[PDB]
Design a protein around this ligand. Structure first.
Ligand SMILES: Nc1ncnc2c1ncn2[C@@H]1O[C@H](COP(=O)(O)OP(=O)(O)OP(=O)(O)O)[C@@H](O)[C@H]1O
Lengths: 843, 95
């Protein structure tokens, strides 16, 4: 077809435009004409992508009103092709201008006096500078932008203890861009003032001269302010002598990857507390005088909203001084703290954040700004965030690694660059939940709304209303926290909307008549993050989202996903937080090649299946009766099952001579790494048995068993798993009065979680937990006492007990005493803590 | 060997495809030899340096051209065709 050719020539043009945009994002464009040129090219790039998507999907529909739809597609592709040629003909000079792009050393200025709340931090780093090996050791101070790294570094740099200890103290302002030669000349200028003799000396010979100067000066400290790369550290460190005189390097940086590679345990800077934020703000606004009582109430609120960041407090203090000393004006600043940081003061907050943001790779920028779609101060599930980047299309990677492994590397890269903060880390070390600081969150909102137009918030404000069709013709994605039912009531027309992110934290039971609003208003809906919205029924419009990649919804009345779901071939992630105990997926989802997750909450009875689902990774809950041989043939690269239902059929063996059950199929997966089991049988009194380990999965890493009533005798078979690291038992997962362990087992086990155990006694051996780190005993009221062999674990870190009996508390005290004695014998503690209340009983 | 699989109706897309196939261990040896065969085509017909300059995607770089290894291979290309030129007319990177 000639239409196929038209899309081909269009695609080559966008190949140049996308390459132009990627190289245009490598640095900030300050010229206003270039800014609009980038916005125009980005707009036509996006709109062309929205039209090729219409062509490729409609072609897929045509393979299985078609004339009219094809005519409309060809008419559209004709229009964008004309618009592309319009840019290439009229804006031809402009495209060259950005292509043909190519100073003063702005060393930061910090508080020399009135440094609030850094006394403890300064002493911690100073005492760390004193100790260590005689060789060169680095003490990197790492944190988010504007945290006070240079302020603490200068506090240490001028500290009387440091000035006495270190004869030579050098401050070097490293940065994103620097001259390796000028740094060595700067250090040399500290000692000898004759600069004319080094006019032609090579750089490496200058580094040799720096070596002689620092070496003769005895023990020395060097403040490498704002080192951005490890390559810069290697280039500069060649001039630092290793004389064996305990000389140190204090390396403030925003990068944790650089910090860790210079010292294994980087020093992370702290945030100011709520009391310290008000003390600093009051000091900045008022010159050595107390706050008036009328201004104390709004001033405290402002300091709280700065989230303990000294940069935000200093910026907001400049606004407060200009706004007089009136309660009304200080109330206006409190209502718009974020606006005064980024928009009103671009030199202080906006420009400093741009240093880290513009340094990101082009793919990481779309991922970082996407974190600002969620409400300010909220905590984002890391698993949910990862699947959002991949489903949207920010993870463009063509290597052999799985996409979620690459995205997890991207998320860890953002955390390493301290653009994202981790709240919860799993015992295995992975990221569980993350949040963006309030200053960076306003940057993410402003950047992805006005400059990049990545997403748009929808709210009913005083000066803002629900956008009209003139605004919706521009919006790429929508995020909305509240008032969703009324926005869907007015029947919007989001033609170019690729995402609908209901980032609200409160469940909303939408009326059934507004259900088809979401799929009918946004035909190009790729990502539908409707996790908070409760849907009681489906509709044919809901299954017309042929461009859909991500779908999350919560149901109470929907007992079965209809087979119409199978028309959406582009979906990757399925999430259904259904409260029902049963759920049937009628759709033939096996033919969706890019299907990756099925995070059901009930026993999923998948339908019956030369083709391989190479991408499928996770099944949260599946029916045991659906564990056919064909199912596991299609999922070789899968990495997690979950089995909820009647486990009796899983373990029962027929009398026809076949002694292998459905568990044999589970163990044949050569890439499994997570298994979860939930048993529904409760009327029977049978305690269950566990199959032998030679039919278990070879590469299983994590387990989680709930309410299965396994006998305590058969988990010595579970100890034969060589690569087991995580094990969770919940809701009386095991039954029996006595627990005894055989020799060996758990060669790599790291965490064991137990809730509502049925046992009363437990006996163990020293070889059972060679590498155990964490043990959890929650609601274990039946526990009499713990075995004393648990104190032989050298790698143990934490044992936590909740609602334990009096005798169990005595055993916990005895184990704690033995662990304390062993640690006091010469083994440094790993940070043990124990929950006891009251402390006076049993002392 | 067949001219159909050598002309390929383009050179820049082929060059990018060869680099993309290079990250796969099972395609590293095939992509490496095919990369050399692309240079064979560059020498056989003596295309203008403008085409090879765009094929290497050196068109987006400021002061960073020299440190880029693609610039070094771009210099090695003009040296190679200056040892295989059909006529003594010089070929230069400067234009
Ligand atoms: N403890 C503090 N008391 C008072 N002001 C502080 C404190 N810490 C930082 N500030 C102020 O915060 C602002 C930014 O702090 P600082 O210059 O130390 O940034 P930083 O953490 O080194 O960041 P960057 O990575 O951007 O260099 C400065 O104006 C500084 O005066």
């Amino acid at each position: 077809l000639g239409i196929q050719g038209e899309v081909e020539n269009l695609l080559t043009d966008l190949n140049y435009f996308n390459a132009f945009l990627k190289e245009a994002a490598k640095s900030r464009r300050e010229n206003e004409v270039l800014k609009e040129l980038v916005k125009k090219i980005r707009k036509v790039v996006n709109d062309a992508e929205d039209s090729i998507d219409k062509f490729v999907v409609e072609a897929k529909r045509h393979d299985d009103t078609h004339v009219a739809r094809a005519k409309g597609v060809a008419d559209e592709i004709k229009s964008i092709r004309e618009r592309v040629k319009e840019i290439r003909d009229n804006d031809a000079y402009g495209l060259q201008a950005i292509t043909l792009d190519d100073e003063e050393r702005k060393a930061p200025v910090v508080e020399e006096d009135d440094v609030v709340g850094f006394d403890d931090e300064a002493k911690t780093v100073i005492d760390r500078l004193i100790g260590g090996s005689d060789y060169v050791e680095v003490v990197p101070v790492v944190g988010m932008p504007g945290l006070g790294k240079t302020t603490l570094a200068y506090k240490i740099y001028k500290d009387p203890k440091v000035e006495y200890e270190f004869f030579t103290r050098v401050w070097v302002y490293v940065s994103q861009t620097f001259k390796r030669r000028e740094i060595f000349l700067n250090i040399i200028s500290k000692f000898t003032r004759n600069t004319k003799q080094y006019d032609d000396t090579p750089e490496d010979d200058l580094a040799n001269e720096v070596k002689e100067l620092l070496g003769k000066g005895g023990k020395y400290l060097i403040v490498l302010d704002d080192v951005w790369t490890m390559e810069a550290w290697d280039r500069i460190k060649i001039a630092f002598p290793n004389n064996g005189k305990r000389n140190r390097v204090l390396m403030t940086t925003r990068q944790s990857n650089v910090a860790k590679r210079c010292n294994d345990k980087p020093h992370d800077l702290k945030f100011l507390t709520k009391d310290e934020s008000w003390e600093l703000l009051e000091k900045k606004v008022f010159h050595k005088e107390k706050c008036p009582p009328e201004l104390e109430l709004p001033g405290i609120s402002i300091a709280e909203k700065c989230m303990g960041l000294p940069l935000a407090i200093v910026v907001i203090a400049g606004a407060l001084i200009g706004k007089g000393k009136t309660t009304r004006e200080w109330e206006l600043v409190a209502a718009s703290v974020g606006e005064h940081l980024i928009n009103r003061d671009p030199e202080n907050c906006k420009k400093l954040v741009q240093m880290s943001y513009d340094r990101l790779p082009y793919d990481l920028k779309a991922c970082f700004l996407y974190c600002g779609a969620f409400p300010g101060g909220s905590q984002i599930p890391a698993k949910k965030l990862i699947r959002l980047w991949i489903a949207e299309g920010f993870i463009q990677y063509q290597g052999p690694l799985a996409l979620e492994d690459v995205a997890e590397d991207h998320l860890n890269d953002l955390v390493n660059r301290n653009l994202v903060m981790v709240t919860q880390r799993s015992c295995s070390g992975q990221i569980k939940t993350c949040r963006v600081h309030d200053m960076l969150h306003e940057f993410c909102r402003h950047e992805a709304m006005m400059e990049e137009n990545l997403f748009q918030e929808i709210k009913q404000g005083q000066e803002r209303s629900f956008p009209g069709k003139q605004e919706l013709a521009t919006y790429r994605r929508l995020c909305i926290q509240s008032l969703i039912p009324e926005f869907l009531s007015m029947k919007p027309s989001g033609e170019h909307v690729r995402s609908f992110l209901c980032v609200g934290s409160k469940k909303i039971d939408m009326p059934p008549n507004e259900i088809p609003s979401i799929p009918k208003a946004f035909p190009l809906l790729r990502v539908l993050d409707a996790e908070s919205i409760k849907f009681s029924r489906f509709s044919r419009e809901f299954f017309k989202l042929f461009h859909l990649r991500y779908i999350a919804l919560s149901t109470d009345k929907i007992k079965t996903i209809p087979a119409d779901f199978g028309n959406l071939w582009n979906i990757q992630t399925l999430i259904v937080e259904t409260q029902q105990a049963t759920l049937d997926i009628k759709a033939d989802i096996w033919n969706m090649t890019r299907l990756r997750h099925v995070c059901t909450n009930a026993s999923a009875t998948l339908p019956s299946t030369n083709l391989v689902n190479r991408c499928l990774q996770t099944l949260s809950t599946i029916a045991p009766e659906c564990c056919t041989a064909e199912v596991f043939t299609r999922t070789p690269n899968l990495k997690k099952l979950g089995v909820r239902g009647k486990i009796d059929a899983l373990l029962e063996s027929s009398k026809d001579g076949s002694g292998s059950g459905l568990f044999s199929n589970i163990g044949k997966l050569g890439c499994l790494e997570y298994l979860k089991l939930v048993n529904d049988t409760r009327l029977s009194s049978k305690p269950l048995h566990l199959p032998p380990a030679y039919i278990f999965p070879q590469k299983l890493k994590k387990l989680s068993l709930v309410d299965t009533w396994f006998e305590w005798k058969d988990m010595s078979i579970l100890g034969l798993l060589p690569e087991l690291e995580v094990l969770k038992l919940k809701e009386n997962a095991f039954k029996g009065q006595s627990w005894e362990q055989e020799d060996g087992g758990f060669p790599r086990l790291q965490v064991l979680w137990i809730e509502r155990t049925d046992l009363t006694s437990w006996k163990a051996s020293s070889g059972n937990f060679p590498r155990l780190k964490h043990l959890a005993l929650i609601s274990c009221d039946k526990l009499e006492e713990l075995p004393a062999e648990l104190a032989d674990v050298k790698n143990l870190q934490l044992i936590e007990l909740q609602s334990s009996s009096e005798s169990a508390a005595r055993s916990a005290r005895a184990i704690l005493k033995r662990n304390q004695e062993k640690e006091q014998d010469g083994d440094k503690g790993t940070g043990f803590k124990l929950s006891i209340f009251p402390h006076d009983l049993g002392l | 060997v067949i001219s159909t699989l050598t002309s390929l109706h383009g050179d820049k897309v082929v060059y990018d495809t060869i680099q993309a196939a290079k990250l796969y261990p099972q395609l590293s040896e095939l992509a490496l030899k095919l990369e050399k065969d692309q240079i064979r085509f560059w020498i056989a017909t003596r295309k203008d340096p403008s085409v090879v300059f765009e094929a290497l995607n050196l068109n987006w770089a400021g002061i960073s051209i020299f440190p880029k290894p693609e610039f070094s291979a771009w210099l090695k290309y003009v040296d190679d065709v200056n040892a295989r030129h059909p006529k003594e007319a010089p070929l230069s990177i400067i234009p």
